[PDB]
Scaffold this motif. Structure first.
Motif, PDB file in Angstrom:
ATOM      1  N   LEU A  25     -39.943  40.856  23.577  1.00 65.42           N
ATOM      2  CA  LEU A  25     -41.166  40.428  22.925  1.00 65.42           C
ATOM      3  C   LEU A  25     -41.847  39.262  23.615  1.00 65.42           C
ATOM      4  O   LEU A  25     -43.028  39.035  23.373  1.00 65.42           O
ATOM      5  N   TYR A  26     -41.102  38.500  24.403  1.00 69.54           N
ATOM      6  CA  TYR A  26     -41.632  37.311  25.074  1.00 69.54           C
ATOM      7  C   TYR A  26     -40.985  37.208  26.443  1.00 69.54           C
ATOM      8  O   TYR A  26     -39.936  37.806  26.671  1.00 69.54           O
ATOM      9  N   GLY A  64     -23.755  36.462  17.009  1.00 76.03           N
ATOM     10  CA  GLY A  64     -24.198  35.430  17.916  1.00 76.03           C
ATOM     11  C   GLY A  64     -25.695  35.400  18.097  1.00 76.03           C
ATOM     12  O   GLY A  64     -26.421  36.313  17.700  1.00 76.03           O
ATOM     13  N   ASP A  65     -26.171  34.297  18.689  1.00 79.45           N
ATOM     14  CA  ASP A  65     -27.567  34.159  19.073  1.00 79.45           C
ATOM     15  C   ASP A  65     -27.850  34.622  20.487  1.00 79.45           C
ATOM     16  O   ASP A  65     -29.015  34.679  20.886  1.00 79.45           O
ATOM     17  N   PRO A  86     -31.645  35.755  24.363  1.00 78.93           N
ATOM     18  CA  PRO A  86     -31.729  35.286  22.969  1.00 78.93           C
ATOM     19  C   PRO A  86     -32.035  36.422  21.984  1.00 78.93           C
ATOM     20  O   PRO A  86     -32.981  37.180  22.172  1.00 78.93           O
ATOM     21  N   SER A  87     -31.263  36.490  20.899  1.00 78.91           N
ATOM     22  CA  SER A  87     -31.309  37.613  19.983  1.00 78.91           C
ATOM     23  C   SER A  87     -32.671  37.769  19.341  1.00 78.91           C
ATOM     24  O   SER A  87     -33.074  38.916  19.011  1.00 78.91           O
ATOM     25  N   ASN A  88     -33.411  36.669  19.213  1.00 76.80           N
ATOM     26  CA  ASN A  88     -34.722  36.729  18.568  1.00 76.80           C
ATOM     27  C   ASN A  88     -35.842  37.082  19.557  1.00 76.80           C
ATOM     28  O   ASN A  88     -37.023  37.062  19.158  1.00 76.80           O
ATOM     29  N   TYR A  89     -35.516  37.509  20.777  1.00 73.79           N
ATOM     30  CA  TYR A  89     -36.531  37.782  21.784  1.00 73.79           C
ATOM     31  C   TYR A  89     -36.761  39.267  21.963  1.00 73.79           C
ATOM     32  O   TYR A  89     -37.573  39.645  22.794  1.00 73.79           O
TER      33      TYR A  89
END
Length: 59
Positions: A7-8, A34-35, A51-54
């Motif tokens: 996403l980024y 994990g992150d 990173p898991s949020n990416y």
């Protein structure tokens, strides 16, 4: 989900993380804890932690 899309943009900062571009697709076989998840780039063939949020699903 085992194939994901960025996403980024992310630039690596140490020896274990993987740099990638928005839209790049990543194989991630273990995303259950994990992150940071070990990912393999379908674009560059490089491997490392992201990173898991990416990422969002891509399969």
């Amino acid at each position: 989900v085992t194939t994901f899309v960025a996403l980024y943009d992310y630039e690596s900062r140490t020896e274990t993380d993987l740099s990638f571009k928005k839209g790049e697709r990543l194989q991630i076989l273990n995303s259950s804890e994990g992150d940071w998840w070990l990912a393999h780039s379908l674009t560059t063939g490089e491997t490392g932690y992201i990173p898991s949020n990416y990422v969002a699903p891509s399969d």
